[PDB]
Amino acid sequence: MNIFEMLRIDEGLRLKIYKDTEGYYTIGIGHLLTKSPDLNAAKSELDKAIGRNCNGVITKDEAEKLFNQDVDAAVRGILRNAKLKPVYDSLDAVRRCAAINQVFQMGETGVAGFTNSLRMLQQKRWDEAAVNLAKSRWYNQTPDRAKRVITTFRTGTWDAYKN
Ligand SMILES: c1cc2c([nH]1)CCCC2
């Protein structure tokens, strides 16, 4: 297991524009296109992202390219964030993957609301952090994914995914 395999499980792979859990146009491996309800705006974002006229469909290679870019940008964003970098750098490699996964799903506006959880993670109070992480809109809206990510934060193992 690694961050790519983990996010591939959590995000799936779809080659046509679909709506994500929040109702937003998305493609590939959780590549958000737009929060606009206009499918035409989503198609324009897709074409811009891929560099050709896609008419709402991409190939697996193209999906994996966006995924590579999105994971890299997620990690780099963490390192550029003053609140997130010290917490991230305090973690072991497996728990770092849980952090990347969260940021990938929620963005940095989303994790902004996880400050208290962040402190507990930096303190390595794993069970307490796990309890706090579940007291969230995130958990309530995507509980089976959040449970996997939280187990990863709690244990520093891949137990929630290896199966
Ligand atoms: C839990 C810890 C961290 C996150 N979740 C997201 C950004 C990096 C630090």
UniProtKB/Swiss-Prot annotation:
Gene3D superfamilies: 1.10.530.40. GO terms for biological process: cell wall macromolecule catabolic process; defense response to bacterium; peptidoglycan catabolic process; viral release from host cell by cytolysis. Changing residue 11 to N: Loss of 84% of enzymatic activity. This is Endolysin. The keyword Hydrolase applies. Keywords: Antimicrobial, Bacteriolytic enzyme, Cytolysis, Glycosidase, Host cell lysis by virus, Host cytoplasm, Hydrolase, Viral release from host cell. Belongs to the glycosyl hydrolase 24 family. Its EC number is 3.2.1.17. Transmembrane segments: none annotated. The gene is E. Induction: Expressed late in the viral replication. Pfam families: Phage_lysozyme. The active site is at residues 11, 20. Substrate binds at residues 32, 104, 117, 132. HAMAP family: ENDOLYSIN_T4 (MF_04110). The keyword ATP-binding does not apply. GO terms for molecular function: lysozyme activity. Changing residue 20 to E/Q: Loss of 99% of enzymatic activity. It is an enzyme of class 3 (hydrolase). Changing residue 132 to M/F: 2-fold decrease in enzymatic activity.
